[PDB]
Enzyme design. Sequence first.
Site, PDB file in Angstrom:
ATOM      1  N   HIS A 141       7.952  -7.881  -2.078  1.00 35.33           N
ATOM      2  CA  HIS A 141       7.506  -6.344  -2.541  1.00 35.33           C
ATOM      3  C   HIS A 141       8.881  -5.685  -2.032  1.00 35.33           C
ATOM      4  O   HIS A 141       9.016  -4.987  -0.762  1.00 35.33           O
ATOM      5  CB  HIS A 141       6.450  -5.916  -1.677  1.00 35.33           C
ATOM      6  CG  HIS A 141       5.384  -6.685  -1.962  1.00 35.33           C
ATOM      7  ND1 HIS A 141       4.816  -7.737  -1.734  1.00 35.33           N
ATOM      8  CD2 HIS A 141       4.193  -5.778  -2.806  1.00 35.33           C
ATOM      9  CE1 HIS A 141       3.710  -8.145  -2.404  1.00 35.33           C
ATOM     10  NE2 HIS A 141       3.320  -6.891  -3.113  1.00 35.33           N
ATOM     11  N   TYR A 176     -12.992  -9.845   0.667  1.00 28.69           N
ATOM     12  CA  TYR A 176     -12.558 -10.537  -0.361  1.00 28.69           C
ATOM     13  C   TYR A 176     -13.337 -11.763  -1.034  1.00 28.69           C
ATOM     14  O   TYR A 176     -14.134 -12.312   0.063  1.00 28.69           O
ATOM     15  CB  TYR A 176     -11.164 -11.013   0.094  1.00 28.69           C
ATOM     16  CG  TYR A 176     -10.323  -9.863   0.177  1.00 28.69           C
ATOM     17  CD1 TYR A 176      -9.486  -8.991  -0.541  1.00 28.69           C
ATOM     18  CD2 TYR A 176     -10.154  -9.528   1.572  1.00 28.69           C
ATOM     19  CE1 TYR A 176      -8.631  -7.918  -0.132  1.00 28.69           C
ATOM     20  CE2 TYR A 176      -9.236  -8.559   2.323  1.00 28.69           C
ATOM     21  CZ  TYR A 176      -8.511  -7.778   1.034  1.00 28.69           C
ATOM     22  OH  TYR A 176      -7.747  -6.762   1.414  1.00 28.69           O
ATOM     23  N   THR A 218      15.179   2.456 -20.468  1.00 31.42           N
ATOM     24  CA  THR A 218      14.937   2.856 -18.889  1.00 31.42           C
ATOM     25  C   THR A 218      14.169   1.640 -18.210  1.00 31.42           C
ATOM     26  O   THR A 218      14.656   1.236 -17.140  1.00 31.42           O
ATOM     27  CB  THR A 218      13.671   3.925 -19.031  1.00 31.42           C
ATOM     28  OG1 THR A 218      13.914   5.123 -19.260  1.00 31.42           O
ATOM     29  CG2 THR A 218      12.875   4.094 -17.625  1.00 31.42           C
ATOM     30  N   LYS A 275       5.427 -13.974  -3.695  1.00 30.37           N
ATOM     31  CA  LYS A 275       5.365 -12.670  -4.477  1.00 30.37           C
ATOM     32  C   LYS A 275       6.034 -11.653  -3.339  1.00 30.37           C
ATOM     33  O   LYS A 275       5.495 -11.454  -2.336  1.00 30.37           O
ATOM     34  CB  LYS A 275       4.025 -12.134  -4.590  1.00 30.37           C
ATOM     35  CG  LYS A 275       4.159 -10.705  -5.210  1.00 30.37           C
ATOM     36  CD  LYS A 275       2.593 -10.258  -5.764  1.00 30.37           C
ATOM     37  CE  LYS A 275       2.935  -8.946  -6.342  1.00 30.37           C
ATOM     38  NZ  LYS A 275       1.391  -8.181  -6.674  1.00 30.37           N
ATOM     39  N   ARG A 323       7.255  -5.308  -8.234  1.00 26.91           N
ATOM     40  CA  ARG A 323       7.593  -4.119  -9.127  1.00 26.91           C
ATOM     41  C   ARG A 323       6.835  -4.267 -10.538  1.00 26.91           C
ATOM     42  O   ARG A 323       7.099  -4.767 -11.371  1.00 26.91           O
ATOM     43  CB  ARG A 323       9.056  -3.978  -9.571  1.00 26.91           C
ATOM     44  CG  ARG A 323       9.398  -2.803 -10.352  1.00 26.91           C
ATOM     45  CD  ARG A 323       9.225  -1.386  -9.550  1.00 26.91           C
ATOM     46  NE  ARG A 323      10.443  -1.359  -8.379  1.00 26.91           N
ATOM     47  CZ  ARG A 323      11.643  -1.336  -8.879  1.00 26.91           C
ATOM     48  NH1 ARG A 323      12.128  -1.188 -10.016  1.00 26.91           N
ATOM     49  NH2 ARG A 323      12.712  -1.349  -7.949  1.00 26.91           N
ATOM     50  N   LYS A 324       5.830  -3.072 -10.432  1.00 30.04           N
ATOM     51  CA  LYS A 324       4.861  -3.026 -11.744  1.00 30.04           C
ATOM     52  C   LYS A 324       5.654  -2.296 -12.872  1.00 30.04           C
ATOM     53  O   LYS A 324       5.432  -1.183 -12.837  1.00 30.04           O
ATOM     54  CB  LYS A 324       3.536  -2.742 -11.167  1.00 30.04           C
ATOM     55  CG  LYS A 324       2.788  -3.562 -10.307  1.00 30.04           C
ATOM     56  CD  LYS A 324       1.518  -2.938  -9.771  1.00 30.04           C
ATOM     57  CE  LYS A 324       0.858  -3.940  -8.803  1.00 30.04           C
ATOM     58  NZ  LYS A 324       1.241  -3.911  -7.414  1.00 30.04           N
ATOM     59  N   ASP A 339       7.205   1.334 -18.276  1.00 31.68           N
ATOM     60  CA  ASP A 339       8.061   2.065 -19.332  1.00 31.68           C
ATOM     61  C   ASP A 339       8.532   0.971 -20.427  1.00 31.68           C
ATOM     62  O   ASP A 339       8.298   0.124 -20.352  1.00 31.68           O
ATOM     63  CB  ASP A 339       9.202   2.713 -18.434  1.00 31.68           C
ATOM     64  CG  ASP A 339       9.299   4.241 -19.093  1.00 31.68           C
ATOM     65  OD1 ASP A 339       9.329   4.356 -20.196  1.00 31.68           O
ATOM     66  OD2 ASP A 339       9.725   5.129 -18.152  1.00 31.68           O
ATOM     67  N   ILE A 340       9.397   1.774 -21.129  1.00 30.49           N
ATOM     68  CA  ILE A 340      10.026   0.780 -22.208  1.00 30.49           C
ATOM     69  C   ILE A 340      11.462   1.068 -22.586  1.00 30.49           C
ATOM     70  O   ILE A 340      12.056   1.989 -21.724  1.00 30.49           O
ATOM     71  CB  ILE A 340       9.117   1.131 -23.573  1.00 30.49           C
ATOM     72  CG1 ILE A 340       9.501   2.537 -24.256  1.00 30.49           C
ATOM     73  CG2 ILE A 340       7.733   0.934 -23.310  1.00 30.49           C
ATOM     74  CD1 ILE A 340       8.697   2.708 -25.445  1.00 30.49           C
ATOM     75  N   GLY A 341      11.944   0.528 -23.582  1.00 28.20           N
ATOM     76  CA  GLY A 341      13.393   1.020 -23.770  1.00 28.20           C
ATOM     77  C   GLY A 341      14.302   0.613 -22.575  1.00 28.20           C
ATOM     78  O   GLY A 341      14.213  -0.241 -21.959  1.00 28.20           O
TER      79      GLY A 341
HETATM   80  O1  LIG Z   1      15.021  11.110 -30.263  1.00 27.91           O
HETATM   81  C1  LIG Z   1      14.001  11.071 -29.663  1.00 27.91           C
HETATM   82  C2  LIG Z   1      13.398   9.870 -29.233  1.00 27.91           C
HETATM   83  N1  LIG Z   1      12.211  10.048 -28.527  1.00 27.91           N
HETATM   84  N2  LIG Z   1      11.564  11.250 -28.178  1.00 27.91           N
HETATM   85  C3  LIG Z   1      10.247  11.179 -27.714  1.00 27.91           C
HETATM   86  O2  LIG Z   1      10.187  11.148 -26.288  1.00 27.91           O
HETATM   87  C4  LIG Z   1       8.930  10.339 -25.755  1.00 27.91           C
HETATM   88  C5  LIG Z   1       9.521   9.541 -24.713  1.00 27.91           C
HETATM   89  O3  LIG Z   1      10.190   9.862 -23.908  1.00 27.91           O
HETATM   90  P1  LIG Z   1      10.149   9.329 -22.537  1.00 27.91           P
HETATM   91  O4  LIG Z   1      11.268   7.887 -22.225  1.00 27.91           O
HETATM   92  O5  LIG Z   1      10.731  10.411 -21.429  1.00 27.91           O
HETATM   93  O6  LIG Z   1       9.030   8.820 -21.764  1.00 27.91           O
HETATM   94  C6  LIG Z   1       8.220   9.923 -27.157  1.00 27.91           C
HETATM   95  O7  LIG Z   1       7.222  11.038 -27.263  1.00 27.91           O
HETATM   96  C7  LIG Z   1       9.311  10.121 -28.189  1.00 27.91           C
HETATM   97  O8  LIG Z   1       8.869  10.354 -29.379  1.00 27.91           O
HETATM   98  C8  LIG Z   1      12.305  12.312 -28.389  1.00 27.91           C
HETATM   99  O9  LIG Z   1      11.816  13.391 -28.053  1.00 27.91           O
HETATM  100  N3  LIG Z   1      13.448  12.203 -29.193  1.00 27.91           N
HETATM  101  O1  LIG Z   2      -4.561  -7.717   3.286  1.00 29.58           O
HETATM  102  C1  LIG Z   2      -4.530  -7.716   2.299  1.00 29.58           C
HETATM  103  C2  LIG Z   2      -4.321  -6.438   1.315  1.00 29.58           C
HETATM  104  N1  LIG Z   2      -4.688  -6.497   0.047  1.00 29.58           N
HETATM  105  N2  LIG Z   2      -4.750  -7.728  -0.422  1.00 29.58           N
HETATM  106  C3  LIG Z   2      -4.657  -7.596  -1.990  1.00 29.58           C
HETATM  107  O2  LIG Z   2      -3.653  -7.496  -2.520  1.00 29.58           O
HETATM  108  C4  LIG Z   2      -3.682  -6.772  -3.613  1.00 29.58           C
HETATM  109  C5  LIG Z   2      -2.517  -5.714  -3.487  1.00 29.58           C
HETATM  110  O3  LIG Z   2      -1.377  -6.482  -3.742  1.00 29.58           O
HETATM  111  P1  LIG Z   2       0.093  -5.519  -4.502  1.00 29.58           P
HETATM  112  O4  LIG Z   2       0.481  -4.531  -3.410  1.00 29.58           O
HETATM  113  O5  LIG Z   2       0.976  -6.790  -4.153  1.00 29.58           O
HETATM  114  O6  LIG Z   2      -0.288  -5.185  -5.826  1.00 29.58           O
HETATM  115  C6  LIG Z   2      -5.022  -6.364  -3.992  1.00 29.58           C
HETATM  116  O7  LIG Z   2      -5.940  -7.141  -4.874  1.00 29.58           O
HETATM  117  C7  LIG Z   2      -5.575  -6.156  -2.548  1.00 29.58           C
HETATM  118  O8  LIG Z   2      -7.002  -6.449  -2.463  1.00 29.58           O
HETATM  119  C8  LIG Z   2      -4.675  -8.778   0.181  1.00 29.58           C
HETATM  120  O9  LIG Z   2      -4.646 -10.051  -0.440  1.00 29.58           O
HETATM  121  N3  LIG Z   2      -4.730  -8.733   1.422  1.00 29.58           N
END
Ligand SMILES: O=c1cnn([C@@H]2O[C@H](COP(=O)(O)O)[C@@H](O)[C@H]2O)c(=O)[nH]1
Ligand SMILES: O=c1cnn([C@@H]2O[C@H](COP(=O)(O)O)[C@@H](O)[C@H]2O)c(=O)[nH]1
Lengths: 252, 260
Positions: free
Chosen positions: B59, B215, B98, B57, B90-91, B94-96
């Site tokens: 980062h 842990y 973006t 994994k 990378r968590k 968002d959607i679309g």
């Molecule tokens: O033509 C559009 C399409 N989407 N949205 C809206 O924008 C938000 C998503 O924006 P974001 O990508 O900035 O999160 C949602 O509420 C969606 O209804 C608009 O304002 N105009």
């Molecule tokens: O020394 C460490 C510090 N954090 N974590 C754990 O890792 C995760 C955070 O990882 P991430 O930044 O990759 O999301 C959490 O469950 C945290 O308890 C470990 O395994 N060891």
Amino acid sequence: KATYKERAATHPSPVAAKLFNIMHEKQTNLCASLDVRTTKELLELVEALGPKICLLKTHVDILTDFSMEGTVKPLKALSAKYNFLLFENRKFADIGNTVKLQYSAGVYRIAEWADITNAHGVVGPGIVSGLKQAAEEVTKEPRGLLMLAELSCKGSLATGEYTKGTVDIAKSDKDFVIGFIAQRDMGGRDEGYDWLIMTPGVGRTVDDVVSTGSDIIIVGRGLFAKGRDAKVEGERYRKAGWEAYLRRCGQQ
Amino acid sequence: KATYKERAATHPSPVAAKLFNIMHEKQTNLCASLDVRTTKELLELVEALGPKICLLKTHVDILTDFSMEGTVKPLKALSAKYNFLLFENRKFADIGNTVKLQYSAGVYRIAEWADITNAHGVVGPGIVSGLKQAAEEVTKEPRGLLMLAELSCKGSLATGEYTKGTVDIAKSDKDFVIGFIAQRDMGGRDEGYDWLIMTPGVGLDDKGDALGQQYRTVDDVVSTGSDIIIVGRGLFAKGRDAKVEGERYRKAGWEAYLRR
Ligand SMILES: O=c1cnn([C@@H]2O[C@H](COP(=O)(O)O)[C@@H](O)[C@H]2O)c(=O)[nH]1
Ligand SMILES: O=c1cnn([C@@H]2O[C@H](COP(=O)(O)O)[C@@H](O)[C@H]2O)c(=O)[nH]1
């Protein structure tokens, strides 16, 4: 609620006070959400909308030609010229050094120019404290955070419980967390909190959202897509949102 | 649950099948989660841990010197040489377009090299369909997605209801969504789903080690339903020998699995 002018005078967050003042002075509660592919199109739209907005929501991740010199520099200049704040879309959703660097560094260096940012509350308060610390190390300029309390995307999991949990996280820092991206009022007044409610998906109608408690209307494509004239649409939505605000009953 | 070997033979996801086979063949259910600041240290650790892990994994956002040529290229080489997959931190949330570009472009171009990625379920199934489409456009290599069903961070909102909602989103695509980052079994067997449960935050209850004792132990999480143990700094921090620790955790994880 109190008026924008009143809230600007009492709010604990300098960025929030700055925003409330802009809204009062320019008679606008409109935020233009621009999702375009090029810096050229972005700057064009911002120039046209500047006079009518209090906030510009950028979407830097979809830009094909983002750069500090070509994008941020002129954007900051427009922000200063037309008097509005910058709010970057990036929905932060991590904690620790990972989130601090996603906000402060990389090619985007968001913390260096974005007055306001937003974060998903699912990861816990660590996202608030982490982003707050990153903002402080990057600049002395006022910075604020909005929590994504209520999403509008299909199948989203921002339920009542999730929203309640997000609001609780916001209460951990009234200095840095200035409000929420939400569809309704989030309360807090009886507890000493004055949260900015910014609502997207507005075209629900302006009157509808403002009447239910929205402080800022976030309008996107309705302002510039389909051959629309952004300067004309900016005024249309500004007038609509401001008039709706004036009709709302204030705290006496 | 069936054995890793058995699960690999019937899994609908090519990535999950590949991972389960790696686990069986190398006798490991260990994932090393490395969060170092430099590519040099990262590559050293991966080389040392390669023989003992089924998954690495990364980062990338915390690296101070990331490069496709200097970081990704060598990483893919190590992945092929030692036979383990790549999972980028990378968590996504968002959607679309973006989320598609956050996954496919930028300086990191994650989809080009990460076999596995993960997404927050809060934004809805759009994150699954979007990342899936981006993966198909970027590379011919199979890609897999994990949903962040249960977070371990302080004050997280991954409640039972949120977790259930995330699990339902995963059900929308058994070909692409291969499992979850979680602290317990998510079920699904009676419904025809075979999800990989990857659990972070595991220790070995080492003598005098209060930090690691914070842990849950390897035995605890595996005997409970975790398929892969994601171990962090306990593998290399405090002047530890990564190769030695890698074997310690691999051994513990595998023995717990066999006990199961
Ligand atoms: O033509 C559009 C399409 N989407 N949205 C809206 O924008 C938000 C998503 O924006 P974001 O990508 O900035 O999160 C949602 O509420 C969606 O209804 C608009 O304002 N105009
Ligand atoms: O020394 C460490 C510090 N954090 N974590 C754990 O890792 C995760 C955070 O990882 P991430 O930044 O990759 O999301 C959490 O469950 C945290 O308890 C470990 O395994 N060891």
